């Protein structure tokens, strides 16, 4: 059996469709800015969100309590395979890549993470490079600063 904390939340549209996800990580609730909807959570949906347009990110501070049920980011990540909801992701030459036909609407927001459980990046969109989809993500470098990879022809999910 799998018992996993309160970290990934649904973001629904007007009639209720899941159009994206929001995550608890490093003391903040966060979600892609382009995802226009409401976080499906009684406490989280009422918080005041700060807009970070240069990274397609929108974040608010995790309530003192929820602070323990949260992910953790990680700077150092070599090439190789990673994990995500739909299976194995793939860091290769500075860009993550998943098979064609896997990514789609509602997949923006979910984390890509290692085997140790640290979040490497968060998904935003994808540009199809023939047989694999290159991912557009918010990732982070050695001295903290977050980077924002965006492939050519990326259509945000």
UniProtKB/Swiss-Prot annotation:
Catalytic residues (positions): 34 (charge relay system), 56 (charge relay system), 108 (charge relay system)
Effect of mutating residue 40 to H/Y: No loss of autocatalytic cleavage by capsid protein. No infectious virus is produced
Site-annotated residues for Involved in dimerization of the capsid protein: 82, 115
Domain of life: Viruses
Outcome of substituting residue 56 to N: No loss of autocatalytic cleavage by capsid protein. Infectious virus is produced
Compartments reported by the entry: Virion; Host cytoplasm; Host cell membrane; Host nucleus
Effect after changing residue 34 to R: No loss of autocatalytic cleavage by capsid protein. No infectious virus is produced
Domain Peptidase S3: 7-157
Region entry Interaction with spike glycoprotein E2, spans: 50-55, 142-146
Region (Dimerization of the capsid protein): 78-88, 114-118
Substitution effect: residue 34 to A/P: Complete loss of autocatalytic cleavage by capsid protein
Domain notes: The very N-terminus also plays a role in the particle assembly process. The N-terminus also contains a nuclear localization signal and a supra nuclear export signal (supraNES), which is an unusually strong NES that mediates host CRM1 binding in the absence of RanGTP and thus can bind CRM1, not only in the nucleus, but also in the cytoplasm. The C-terminus functions as a protease during translation to cleave itself from the translating structural polyprotein.
Assembly description: Homomultimer. Interacts with host karyopherin KPNA4; this interaction allows the nuclear import of the viral capsid protein. Interacts with spike glycoprotein E2. Interacts with host IRAK1; the interaction leads to inhibition of IRAK1-dependent signaling.
Task performed by this protein: Forms an icosahedral capsid with a T=4 symmetry composed of 240 copies of the capsid protein surrounded by a lipid membrane through which penetrate 80 spikes composed of trimers of E1-E2 heterodimers. The capsid protein binds to the viral RNA genome at a site adjacent to a ribosome binding site for viral genome translation following genome release. Possesses a protease activity that results in its autocatalytic cleavage from the nascent structural protein.
Protein name per the record: Capsid protein
């Amino acid at each position: 059996l799998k018992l996993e904390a309160d970290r990934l939340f649904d973001v629904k549209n007007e009639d209720g469709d899941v159009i994206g996800h929001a995550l608890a990580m490093e003391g903040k609730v966060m979600k892609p800015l382009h995802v226009k909807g409401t976080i499906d959570h009684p406490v989280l949906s009422k918080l005041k969100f700060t807009k970070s347009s240069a990274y397609d990110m929108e974040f608010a501070q995790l309530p003192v309590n929820m602070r323990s049920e949260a992910f953790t980011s990680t700077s150092g990540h070599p090439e190789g395979f990673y994990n995500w909801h739909h299976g194995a992701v793939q860091y290769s030459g500075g860009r993550f890549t998943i098979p064609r036909g896997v990514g789609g609407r509602g997949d923006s927001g979910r984390p890509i993470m290692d085997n140790s459980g640290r979040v490497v990046a968060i998904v935003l969109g994808g540009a199809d490079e023939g047989t694999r989809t290159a991912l557009s993500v918010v990732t982070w470098n050695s001295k903290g600063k977050t980077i924002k990879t965006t492939p050519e022809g990326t259509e945000e999910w």
